[model samples]
Target: MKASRLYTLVLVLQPQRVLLGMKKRGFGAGRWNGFGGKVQEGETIEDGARRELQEESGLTVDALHKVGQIVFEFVGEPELMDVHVFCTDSIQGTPVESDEMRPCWFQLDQIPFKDMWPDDSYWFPLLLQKKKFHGYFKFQGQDTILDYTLREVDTV
Candidate 1:
């Protein structure tokens, strides 16, 4: 299998408050979601996460918990992404937009799922409930998810 690495940070701001970063390009334009990006050469997943968080949001995480991994194929692409999802309530500095993302915050109940990747609406709730999940999804285009199966585990 062709491999690619991706990292995401679920940043909680206040009681039931989560931050979502906006992508300025591609299909999910103007959508709000967590910070993430493809891993770079010679970087560990954690290193890539930290670097991406800083590069996209101008913030640093003090503690990050590796919560889950997802292996999924994108339609028409030869590669599969091995996604590492991390969560942290402890972070430093404010969020700002870089060339890749524009940062924004949303109440847990008020996330703009329509603006995000289609699969987010299905599984994001489980994530907010502090559930670890593994899943596979097929995307037709950047904004459309054709199908998926998510398995979640409660850690609490």
Candidate 2:
């Protein structure tokens, strides 16, 4: 079983705004998503998430609230990716572009999920609601999703 790892930070601001970084790849070829990337040598998950956020968005986060993790298994490729998701409200500096991403902001109602990975729409709402969630997804291609299941945090 081959493995790849990624760390993502979901920056939540007041009035229901989330900071997203743009990635290029699908029908919506150029669109916004979260701030994150593959882990670098000697970097922990939180460290990697922070570094990616800084490198890709030029924003410094004072505190990161780790929400949860998700794993995706692909057929015939690196079968798994461990995605660590965090939340932060304290940020400094404006966003800037790096080779990996172009930073941007999106309102909760206006996220461009059609251009992003298929699973985003499924779980992003939970994040905005400040609820933790775990998900598994099967994909036929970048835009084609076969199936998925989500475990949402029980607040009761």
Candidate 3:
């Protein structure tokens, strides 16, 4: 990779439940995904996740825990995207659609993987089980996974 871009992905959670949103109009648009966005300049990854959660869903985090890191390399793109993955079951406010996302809740058994980035399924269960993980995916394009690896760890 010629460069790297940092980003965050946060999953709000509860017993048998999870929070996801439809990207309203940007990267990942049309997919139901955990809420997140680019890490802002001079901001800690956790802070970015909190800010994005509030911005996208009108929700403020009361609890957050980092669980995984996944690096993605898209075919024809020289830069890699390093995403920090987080989980939180405690937060404030009601879900509301923003210009960026439309929030919704799903039962654990109902995650819409077919409408999300393909790599999500590989590592997501580990996350819900409270395991730490690291993963990498090489994509031929946004919709095709050329190669990937996901492993559990003691720390992210």
**How many clashes in each candidate?**
0, 0, 0
Q: Tell me the lDDT of model 1 at 102.
A: 87
RMSD (Å) of each candidate, 1 decimal: 2.5, 3.1, 1.1
The top-ranked prediction according to TM-score is 3
Model 2: colliding residue pairs:
none
lDDT by candidate, in order shown: 0.73, 0.71, 0.89
TM agreement with the true structure for every prediction? 0.85, 0.83, 0.95
Ten residues in a row with the worst lDDT in model 1?
5-14
lDDT of 1 at 65: 76
- 20-102: candidate 1 lDDT, tens digit per residue: 88888753577776777788888877778777788888888766777666665678987777777777658767888788788
Which 10 consecutive positions of candidate 2 have the poorest summed lDDT? 24-33
Which digits, one per residue and each the tens of the lDDT, describe model 3 over residues 21-100? 99889787999999899999988999999898889888888667999999999988899999999988587678999999
Q: Highest lDDT among the candidates is held by which one?
A: 3
Q: Which of the predicted structures, 1 or 3, would earn the higher TM-score when compared with the native? A: 3
Give the residue spans of candidate 3 off by over 4 A: none
